Design a protein around this ligand. Sequence first.
Ligand SMILES: Cc1cc(Oc2ccc(CC(=O)N3CCN(C)C(=O)C3)cc2)ccc1C#N
Length: 187
Amino acid sequence: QYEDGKQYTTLEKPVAGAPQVLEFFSFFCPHCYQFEEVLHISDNVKKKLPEGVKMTKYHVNFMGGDLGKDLTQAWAVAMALGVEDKVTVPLFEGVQKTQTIRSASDIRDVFINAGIKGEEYDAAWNSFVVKSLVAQQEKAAADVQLRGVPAMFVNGKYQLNPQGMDTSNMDVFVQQYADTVKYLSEK
Ligand SMILES: Cc1cc(Oc2ccc(CC(=O)N3CCN(C)C(=O)C3)cc2)ccc1C#N
């Protein structure tokens, strides 16, 4: 039922110490927008994972020019402060839906209207911790030879292959995607 090359591929050099379930996304990515707002891929995968398996989500730079680097640093700020749930949707909608986020100051404004004080954002933005988080996201992308998003990796060894699943129907696609992660997570 689950064959290498159909629902998933296998990295030739597995990534030592990778997060068990690792998602890569970009706020510029249209498929990542639907994974968040329509398909809820992340919460559907989470419903089917075994006990205690942690899910990690990293932002990538190669979409959207110099604003893409700023969005990776902003996602680092969100992870450092734990405000992902308050900024994920306003950032997606400001980048892709309204296209009113076009600069670092527009990103900042999203965090402030979500309740993060400007002095707290500026401190985090310039911290060593966020510097380390930016480098961490870029290293994981390089370590899996990432070329596009959305992408999801299981135990640093298996890469989901959504174009090898049924993409004609949204509910079947979500169930095949989440069941593949569950199968691979038990390996
Ligand atoms: C039912 C459905 C099914 C879909 O199926 C996908 C899903 C993800 C991908 C991955 C992808 O888009 N990319 C970007 C290009 N590159 C270089 C990559 O490696 C990966 C593809 C099809 C997408 C949307 C919807 C909807 N509603």
